[PDB]
């Protein structure tokens, strides 16, 4: 098993993110708008699904 601090560190780059509900782009956890021009910088954002 992965040590918890390393468990959390890897999740910071893979899991703890926000997802656009129009272009699915990976966004930082504090995102309020998507950064991709294809969606018109929408505010329709959802958290990235967790395995738990």
């Amino acid at each position: 098993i992965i040590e918890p601090s390393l468990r959390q560190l890897a999740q910071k780059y893979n899991c703890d993110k926000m997802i656009c509900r129009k272009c699915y782009a990976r966004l930082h956890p504090r995102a309020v708008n998507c950064r991709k021009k294809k969606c018109g910088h929408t505010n329709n954002l959802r958290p990235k699904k967790k395995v738990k």
Partner: protein, 190 residues
């Protein structure tokens, strides 16, 4: 609107020498010399004071966008002051579930070879940016020490390593395997 004037001033340590060649900033300190060129931003740079130096960035008649580069330049200069005084130390940690990631440093920190990432027989040869030295930590295992004077070069070198160890065609929520930046600090502590 167009704002008449917007300026931000950055202090300079007594052990640091900054010279200006137009918009080119040359910062000299104990750890070395850093040069940056700011010809893409129409601003006015001035040096103030003689007993204690001080750099001022001036912008006249800028729009909202042109206004944003004033702090950008100041932050870049402060990073350069940080680099020549204390340097930059980006610590990377290797995370693996089953297959340990074997990192060997070659050409005096210039080439990083990554082996057994996910069990692959592919060896990753990652070339550090010039002026950036990579080493394997001796205090703690599975840790890499990236040291350099330019935050942009040191951080880009870390980014190259991090994106080298990328899991493909697998659920990345599991399979949390790779080398990740764990700490951002300085070679010397103030």
């Amino acid at each position: 609107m167009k704002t008449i004037l917007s300026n931000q001033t950055v202090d300079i340590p007594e052990n640091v020498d900054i010279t200006l060649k137009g918009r080119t900033v040359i910062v000299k300190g104990p750890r070395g010399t850093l040069r940056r060129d700011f010809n893409h931003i129409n601003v006015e740079l001035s040096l103030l004071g003689k007993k204690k130096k001080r750099l001022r960035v001036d912008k006249w008649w800028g729009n909202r966008k042109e206004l944003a580069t004033v702090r950008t330049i100041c932050s870049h200069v402060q990073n350069m002051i940080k680099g020549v005084t204390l340097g930059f130390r980006y610590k990377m940690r290797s995370v693996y579930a089953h297959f340990p990631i074997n990192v060997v440093i070659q050409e005096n920190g210039s080439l990083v070879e990554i082996r057994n990432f996910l069990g692959e027989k592919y060896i990753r040869r990652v070339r550090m940016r010039p002026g950036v030295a990579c080493s394997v930590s001796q205090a703690q295992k599975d840790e890499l020490i990236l040291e350099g004077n330019d935050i942009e070069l040191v951080s880009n070198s870390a980014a190259l390593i991090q994106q080298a160890t990328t899991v493909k065609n697998k659920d990345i929520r599991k399979f949390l395997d790779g080398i990740y930046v764990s700490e951002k600090g300085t070679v010397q502590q103030a």
